[PDB]
Design an enzyme around this catalytic site. Structure first.
Site, PDB file in Angstrom:
ATOM      1  N   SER A 103       0.840  -1.190   0.000  1.00 40.73           N
ATOM      2  CA  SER A 103       0.000   0.000   0.000  1.00 40.73           C
ATOM      3  C   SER A 103       0.877   1.242   0.000  1.00 40.73           C
ATOM      4  CB  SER A 103      -0.934   0.011   1.212  1.00 40.73           C
ATOM      5  OG  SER A 103      -1.740   1.177   1.222  1.00 40.73           O
ATOM      6  N   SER A 104       0.553   2.192  -0.874  1.00 35.88           N
ATOM      7  CA  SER A 104       1.314   3.430  -0.951  1.00 35.88           C
ATOM      8  C   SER A 104       0.984   4.331   0.232  1.00 35.88           C
ATOM      9  CB  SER A 104       1.024   4.150  -2.266  1.00 35.88           C
ATOM     10  OG  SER A 104      -0.342   4.515  -2.356  1.00 35.88           O
ATOM     11  N   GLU A 128     -10.308   6.243   2.312  1.00 33.70           N
ATOM     12  CA  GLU A 128     -10.590   4.991   3.003  1.00 33.70           C
ATOM     13  C   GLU A 128     -11.467   5.279   4.211  1.00 33.70           C
ATOM     14  OE1 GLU A 128      -7.697   6.428   2.979  1.00 33.70           O
ATOM     15  OE2 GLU A 128      -6.684   6.340   4.926  1.00 33.70           O
TER      16      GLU A 128
HETATM   17 MG    MG Z   1       1.814   1.842  -5.962  1.00 34.14          MG
END
Ligand code: MG
Ligand code: ADP
Ligand code: ADP
Ligand code: ADP
Ligand code: ADP
Ligand code: MG
Ligand code: MG
Ligand code: MG
Lengths: 670, 371, 373, 373
Positions: free
Chosen positions: A207-208, A439
């Site tokens: 996850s970035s 999110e």
């Molecule tokens: Mg990425």
């Protein structure tokens, strides 16, 4: 009433993300739609509940590339249109000016050198939707109006944001005649930057945690003159604190295992469970990857980007020092009616001093004391146990942040190729922004609040661009639109960070206020923002969650965790210790700081303050460039080539903010 | 526009910007003027010298303090000091920066009104505010409950606070301070043959006090030890080169804080003042007050003063109680640190006296707004 | 379906709340509302304009404490709403609109009290159903009896209600306004003889604590006078919050004595023993023996040591020798009203006696007079 | 046979002494004891280690003045002995061994003060008889009434005592510690807002004189403040003993206002008007009509120019609009307690209530509790 028709059948299922499915009509008795809802389901519909049946519009019946012209402009219609195209291997769709890409979890053949030239010099709508089309029009409009353009790629983690960035760059590589070695370097830069900038989350293994911007500079009547990588909104609270079922950045794990044992011995490294900075998440090994293989990928990618073996060893020691300082333990002391600390003896303390190449007595005093350094004297003040943990974590976050900047600088040095700026027409850039999406987890914390705050700015930027091209543009040519309402939504942003008594400053104020706790912070937020409709106060005094009405919806943030993450306290003694360090690398990354002399360290920009300024710098860059928006959607959670989960998708549609485009259609002329 | 915190003390001026660790400029609050004849034509001639250069040219100047006992006596000199602080020391235009000022709890209203008028008219600050020093001391100490003993060069005052609620009836003020201690040291030095008269010599005596004076736990035992031995004696070198040796004066000079009868004052000692301030407060409050005896100001930096205060307050208080004298090592600048914290708070940003409010109401707006 | 009822025994001094069925009350806290009386100087501090319950006795030294209920009559109708809001949301953590609530009241109170309680419950908190019951009746439910005269004494009122086989005799109901608050005030007055001075509402709580921890009922008042005057064995010590130590002697049993001799605080009424005897005598001749055999004591004021023994002695002296006087003083009599209320609310036969929202909407606040008692 | 009695109204600030049957006190001097605080240098000067009364004011500049009575309670039993010796010998010129003595005391004082006064009188001065009375009863005696509520206010305490037809209601007696001493201390704190600083115990008397000479009570406090904030008609000038001239404005009426608003000095109690109203309403319903029209004001603190109108206005606003409120403020109320004491001691029926030497010898110092009140 006929048979075999397509009719919007509306289930009364209690799930939050439920929309009409529709199904083909079967047999004749009662409602009897069935014949698969869209997959295999049966519904023995009675005449009494025939109200659940609504006849379906022909434009909705057959999948239409432009969702703007869809007959039933509703979430159910938009969800469905994705579904036929996805079942037919079509993973691209338009919404007027927004591309919607669905991650196939499979290597499809829509991408080819033929597809490059086929989509070359093709306007939106001339061909089926494609990530190339966004790139082409972005390149064409660039030279057409002599204006810098920007592409914004955002979505849920693991929805193909990074891949779409590669494909857009691949298209812009081929539109230029030369092979442009730069792109190969940019692809080589990805494993290094993803290693230091991504971490495992509860939702996705990779996850970035920051925003990636690739400023590929274009020469006059040409392309790929140079490329600059700039990072924004780097989450730094993770370096010291990890949520349950989440782990720190992959670098520490990839480094700690898969290295020569003698190299570990010099650094003093052991296993991964020993370090609290890596084990408090209680998930060391991530299924689906062998990090040792990544270590080879990280080191090999570094070797391509002119990273000498000396540099990696300098980098490794700093990361090694981070882990050893993480295992340092503090004990409370009373001194003389005051608060004092005592760092318990451990091999980590001696190892940390050796790795930092500082005197062990100097490290001890700097961790457990502060000096005023007023004019004429010094005056040393002891620290409390909570303050001692703060300066230790701030130092750890400070090293990692500056180390991350150095890596970006080193990568930039080999790819930037400084464009000749003696000419006024410097270059026409096309920025590519890879940014996280909104999110709403079960437990939302300080990290999510800043993350959600950022998308508020991006959504406002998105809404204004859509509004400008909405009746403000296509009506403006022929049809009247002034009667049509085009109000913006800045009330949420004003409450958060754009008005006096905003949410963020109340968090900052309570961080430094005497006897400040999370409970007291919540009372401040309730007192100031109770009347505001966007703020949802806790129902009871014991409740520790406050609700903020974001654009996507009401999101509840846990009060506990704040005032601990949002404290980056770097005293002057920290910079003094770095300056006196024998290690040149630690002094080099603190180069701006080692030119000290400012007592403004009471500010010591907190994670909230740094995040805002980084966001403002980001928004100014996007503000100068004309935007192009792309949304990426992951169809299903268990990686499968063909599985379209409806509830998962519609959640992403609602949180994406794409529905605002549909809403302004209904207000105008649908 | 960063706020300015200016702690105009009787002895020293602590100035800086809000949100900083330590004061930017700390210089004495004196204005010196030539007292001799200028014979060399062409030499640079200055009518007045303010602060460090006044101390440097101490020989040929006469030194005067604009502020005495917390009340601004000479407003022309005080304006000169403010101008020096704004332009020479901080190098900041006052018209673009809100300014926060400090004041003793029981000063006359004319002082505060005149400060407000000078700030709004002479310097044209966008806004200004006046705050009590003990509250800032608590802010710096990082507590919301406790009794503060702030002793500087002009006054000594106690302010009890509980959960942010101050008890004005229990606030006490005393005029015994470092200036009186310096004068008493000047007087008692004459017994040994050393004579200091001029203001420069008074500054020298202040230096001697700060270097050699300390507080003895048992005054009678310390007197007996000094009479029986030469261990307590210490030597200090005057600027001209002469050396002076002082004995019992070292602990006799600070003792006047506990026995104000030495300088001929009928007031009670600082320990008794603190005990009375605690007793005036409500019975539920007294325990938290006893446990949080915060200390601030330069005059509280004598060695052993915390121990002596703890001993006296323990003797006065009931045995079951726990007496804690909190003396941070940086208590000399605690008022300025608290002022910086207060000015940095976002909640405080709504309580500034803006220029429009002054233009409408007049100088009396300061009583309505500040405290 | 399984909607648990709420029992809220809101007395004058303490508020007892819980769910119908539990053994003991879930939340017990003082019925006080405090407001700041000093000057707030620290900017950015938490500004609350009211403290309710236990939170008002922790920050007690900077507040003025005011009881919204005195002598069982609600005088302030906003502080009482504050207390009810605290009880429902912050103490029980329940939504008032989904639980029927049961309230308690003294025997002889103004009808406006019941009407306003009805209106508040049905218009502000929007309870689905309500009922108001007599505390003295609930004491019998707690004691597990159907016959006997109950002596309930909190800190607002003291009342006697005789009941026989579930039938109450209204003409024999007695009500006195001498109670724990008057006891505390009398002790605070008589402490000035020794030198101790308590004036503030905060010091009233200290005086009440001294009373609760040191006071007792003397079996023979004159002999206890003699012993106290001739010896210091009766003297006890108590430490004030600031560390000072006080010593009290004859006050320990002079303060509770006003229950049996109300002339001390200047009232013309008779003692609790004479009140109980008169209440028994007002009943039928046959009922008197069973009433004598069952004297149920309830309330905090009845928790003094020796009060049961002295009550038995006085009632034995008043009553005929043949009759057997039995004083029933359960160990948990401080919560007997709430326990009986829970038992009553947990009965199937009681579920058609609730006042529903429809009946209030069609009849107004006067439905309680024809439904409850 | 013809042994004239002695009346010694030893207040907190002034000592009023004289003989029974007289019209006014024969010796009115401040109740202080002064001691030198400086160094005596001239050998041969007569050195006194104590100055009592008017000489302590004459030598005010070199002495430390200490009041032995604070809030009606005697704290220094050697200074009190010195003052009593001075009153008996140097002011009255009379041997105390051959004259009965009548003393006054606050209604709600500690019981040890009365016993210590008894022991001192009966063992040090050897008085043949003694009695201790309540000042409000003597105020009624001087006012020549038998029904009325007395508001006595010296500089130690302020108390209310309601009496109807010679019967006192002890449960309605109110005591409040706010009087001339607190007013002087508050004036000494609000005088620093203009630049005047009085900190010495000798400079306290100057502030007391300023309060006695320039302070009045405003009918409407807010209107008076608005008037004082708009002109200079309320300003007055006073000259210090060294020639300096001081000018005060709203401090003239802001100092006496704390009697009606005790929150000015940080007290939680209610004003004197509300205290009087509560004391009246704590009595029987038949007494209130005859108590509303007999508000007798005594004490030196009730000498302000305009207190009798403010008090009448407040009590009229508090009382029902059908009762007649009448405040009786005699021009000589500063000596009303002493005049009533003289009248009571001159009564022929009073001679049987003296505490004789034989009674004290028989019953110890505790005879006074049963012989007085
Ligand atoms: Mg990425
Ligand atoms: N357009 C695409 N074609 C093929 N595979 C894709 C595509 N988009 C995403 N993927 C697959 O998804 C995986 C992770 O996607 P990635 O873009 O790295 O996620 P994120 O957007 O979180 O960085 C990759 O292993 C890749 O194989
Ligand atoms: N080390 C020391 N020991 C004793 N006294 C000191 C010391 N340092 C400073 N002082 C005293 O503190 C006084 C001034 O302190 P400060 O609080 O800065 O003044 P102000 O309160 O007027 O701002 C001086 O008069 C000096 O005598
Ligand atoms: N142990 C004890 N001894 C004597 N009195 C008590 C004791 N505990 C409580 N009380 C008195 O009981 C009074 C109120 O008790 P309770 O009857 O439980 O409340 P309520 O009056 O609301 O029914 C208090 O004022 C207190 O003085
Ligand atoms: N004219 C006046 N105006 C206001 N106050 C007065 C006046 N005369 C006397 N007093 C006050 O009365 C106080 C004492 O009066 P007195 O009733 O004799 O006291 P005590 O009853 O204690 O002897 C003094 O403290 C003084 O302040
Ligand atoms: Mg100071
Ligand atoms: Mg009860
Ligand atoms: Mg008197």
């Amino acid at each position: 009433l006929q048979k075999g028709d397509y009719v919007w059948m509306d289930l009364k299922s209690g799930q939050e993300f439920d929309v009409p499915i529709g199904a083909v009509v079967k047999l004749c008795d009662s409602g009897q739609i069935q014949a698969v809802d869209d997959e295999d389901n049966e519904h023995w519909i009675s005449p009494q509940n025939a109200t659940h049946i609504k006849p379906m519009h022909p434009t909705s019946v057959h999948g239409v590339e432009d969702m703007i012209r869809l007959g039933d402009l509703n979430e159910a219609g938009i969800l469905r249109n994705l579904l036929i195209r996805y079942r037919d291997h079509l993973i691209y769709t338009y919404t007027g000016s927004i591309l919607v890409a669905v991650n196939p979890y499979q290597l499809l053949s829509i991408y080819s050198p033929e597809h490059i030239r086929q989509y070359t010099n093709k306007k939106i709508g001339e061909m089926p939707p494609h990530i190339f089309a966004i790139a082409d029009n972005c390149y064409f409009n660039m030279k057409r109006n002599n204006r810098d353009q920007c592409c914004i790629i955002s979505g849920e983690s693991g929805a193909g944001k990074t891949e779409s960035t590669k494909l857009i760059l691949q298209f812009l590589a081929a539109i230029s005649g030369q092979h442009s070695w730069i792109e190969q370097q940019v692809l080589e830069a990805t494993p290094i930057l993803e290693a230091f900038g991504n971490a495992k989350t509860i939702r996705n293994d990779n996850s970035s945690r920051f925003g990636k911007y690739i400023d590929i500079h274009f020469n006059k009547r040409g392309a790929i003159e140079g490329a600059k990588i700039e990072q924004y909104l780097l989450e730094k609270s993770r370096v010291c604190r990890q949520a349950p079922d989440e782990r720190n950045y992959h670098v520490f794990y990839c480094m700690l295992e898969g290295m020569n044992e003698e190299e570990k011995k010099k650094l003093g490294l052991g296993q991964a469970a020993d370090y609290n900075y890596l084990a408090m998440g209680n998930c060391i090994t991530c299924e689906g990857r062998v990090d040792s293989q990544e270590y080879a990928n990280i080191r090999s990618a570094m070797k391509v980007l002119m990273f000498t073996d000396t540099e990696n060893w300098e980098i490794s020691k700093l990361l090694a020092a981070i882990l050893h300082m993480g295992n340092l333990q503090y004990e409370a002391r009373t001194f003389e009616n005051l608060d004092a600390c005592e760092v318990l003896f451990s091999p980590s303390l001696a190892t940390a001093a050796s790795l930092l190449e500082v005197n062990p007595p100097d490290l001890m005093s700097c961790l457990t004391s502060r000096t005023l350094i007023t004019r004429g004297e010094t005056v040393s003040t002891p620290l409390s146990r909570e303050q001692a943990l703060d300066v230790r974590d701030a130092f750890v976050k400070g090293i990692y942040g500056r180390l991350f900047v150095w890596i970006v600088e080193k990568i930039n040095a080999a790819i930037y190729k400084p464009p000749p700026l003696e000419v006024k027409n410097s270059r026409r850039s096309i920025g590519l922004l890879d940014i996280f999406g909104f999110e709403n987890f079960t437990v939302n914390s300080f990290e999510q609040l800043c993350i959600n705050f950022a998308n508020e700015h991006l959504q406002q930027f998105f809404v204004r661009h859509v509004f400008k091209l909405e009746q403000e543009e296509y009506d403006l040519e022929s049809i009247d639109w002034l009667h049509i309402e085009f109000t913006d939504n800045q009330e949420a942003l004003d409450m958060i960070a754009n008005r006096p008594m905003n949410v963020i400053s109340l968090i900052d104020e309570e961080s430094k206020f005497p006897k400040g706790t999370d409970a007291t912070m919540l009372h401040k937020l309730n007192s100031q923002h109770k009347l505001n409709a966007n703020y949802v106060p806790p129902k009871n005094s014991h409740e520790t969650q406050f609700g903020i009405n974001h654009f996507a919806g009401v999101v509840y943030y846990e009060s506990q965790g704040f005032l601990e993450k949002n404290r980056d306290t770097l005293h002057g003694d920290i910079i003094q210790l770095v300056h006196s360090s024998r290690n040149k690398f630690i002094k080099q990354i603190f180069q701006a700081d080692v030119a000290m002399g400012a007592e403004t360290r009471k500010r010591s920009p907190t994670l909230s303050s740094q995040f805002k300024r980084s966001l403002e710098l980001l928004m100014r860059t996007l503000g100068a460039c004309q935007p192009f928006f792309v949304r990426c959607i992951k169809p299903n959670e268990f990686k499968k080539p063909m599985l379209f989960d409806r509830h998962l998708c519609v959640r992403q549609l609602r949180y994406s903010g794409m529905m605002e485009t549909i809403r302004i259609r209904h207000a105008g002329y649908p | 526009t960063t706020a300015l915190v200016c702690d105009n003390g009787s002895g020293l001026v602590k100035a800086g910007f809000a949100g900083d660790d330590a004061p930017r400029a700390v210089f004495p609050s004196i204005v010196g003027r030539p007292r001799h004849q200028g014979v060399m034509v062409g030499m640079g001639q200055k009518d007045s010298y303010v602060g460090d250069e006044a101390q440097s040219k101490r020989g040929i100047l006469t030194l005067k303090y604009p502020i005495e006992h917390g009340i601004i006596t000479n407003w022309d000199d005080m304006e000169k000091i403010w101008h020096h602080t704004f332009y020479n020391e901080l190098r900041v235009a006052p018209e673009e920066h809100p300014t926060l000022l400090t004041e003793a709890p029981l000063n006359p209203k004319a002082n505060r009104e005149k400060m407000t008028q000078i700030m709004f008219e002479t310097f044209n600050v966008p806004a200004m505010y006046v705050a009590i020093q003990a509250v800032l001391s608590l802010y710096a100490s990082g507590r919301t409950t406790g009794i503060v003993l702030d002793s500087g060069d002009g006054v000594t005052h106690n302010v009890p606070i509980y959960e942010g609620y101050a008890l004005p009836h229990a606030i006490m003020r005393l005029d015994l301070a470092g200036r009186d201690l310096t004068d008493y040291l000047m007087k008692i030095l004459t017994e040994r043959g050393y004579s200091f008269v001029t203001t420069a010599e008074r500054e020298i005596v202040r230096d001697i006090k700060e270097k050699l004076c300390y507080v003895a736990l048992d005054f009678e035992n310390e007197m007996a030890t000094a009479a029986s031995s030469s261990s307590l004696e210490k030597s200090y070198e005057l600027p001209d080169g002469q050396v002076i040796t002082i004995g019992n004066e070292r602990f006799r000079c600070p003792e006047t804080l506990f026995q104000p009868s030495f300088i001929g004052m009928e007031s009670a000692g600082i320990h008794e003042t603190t005990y009375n301030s605690i007793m005036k407060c409500d019975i539920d409050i007294r325990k938290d007050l006893y446990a949080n005896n915060v200390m601030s100001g330069g005059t509280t930096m004598y060695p052993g003063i915390a121990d002596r205060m703890q001993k006296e307050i323990t003797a006065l208080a009931p045995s079951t109680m726990k007496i804690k004298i909190i003396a941070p090592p940086e208590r000399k600048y605690s008022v300025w640190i608290g002022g910086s914290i207060l000015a940095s708070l976002s909640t405080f940003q709504q309580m500034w006296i803006t220029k429009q409010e002054y233009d409408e109401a007049g100088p009396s707006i300061v009583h309505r707004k500040c405290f």
